[PDB]
Amino acid sequence: VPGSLVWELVKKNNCFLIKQFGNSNAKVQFSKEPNNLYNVHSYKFSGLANSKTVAVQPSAVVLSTTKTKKQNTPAKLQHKTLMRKEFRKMAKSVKNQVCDNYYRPDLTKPALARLSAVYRSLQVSKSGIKKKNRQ
């Protein structure tokens, strides 16, 4: 079952999709799944309708990519790496496992953006926010 077929089955309703404000122009949608970098309900970003996916979540930052020949076996579907180095070294590994490999090069900018937000979130976790970012 290819990703295009899976997308049409899960597009309308989903255990991870959150919809709000009805079906007018007011509608706001998001996705809750991991391996969904921007948490957006779209084919490009969906963690359910794509064979190759990247997950950038904290724990230390865990990067996870899925194996294409292990779709039928969920227990071995995720190849996970845990990195505790400096940001640039982590940013280099994300570019290596996502861009240079040709494993979803279209996600290299969303993945680096999410790694920035996750690393920044961890930065303030150890030392509380001493300045607010309104400028």
Partner 1 sequence: RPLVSVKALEGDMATDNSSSLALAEVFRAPLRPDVVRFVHRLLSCN
Partner 2 sequence: ELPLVISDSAESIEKTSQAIKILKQVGAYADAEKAKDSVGIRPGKGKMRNR
Partner 3 sequence: VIWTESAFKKLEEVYGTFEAPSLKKKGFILPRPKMANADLGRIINSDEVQSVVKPLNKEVKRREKRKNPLKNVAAVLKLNPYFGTARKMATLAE
By CB under 8 A, name the binding residues for partner 3: 1-5
9 vs 122, beta carbon nearer partner 3: 9
Q: Which one of residues 1, 15, 26, 129 is an interface residue with partner 1 (CB under 8 A)?
A: 1
Contact status: 5 vs partner 1 (CB under 8 A)? yes
Q: How far is the CB of 68 from partner 1 (least distance, A)?
A: 15
The answer for residues whose C-beta is within 8 angstroms of residue 65's C-beta and 6 or more apart is: 52, 53, 54, 55, 78, 79, 97, 98, 103
Judged by beta carbon distances under 5 to 8 A according to partner kind, the member of partner 3, partner 2, partner 1, none in contact with residue 2 is partner 3
CA 60 to chain centre: 16
Residues at the site binding partner 1, with contacts judged by CB under 8 A: 1, 5, 9
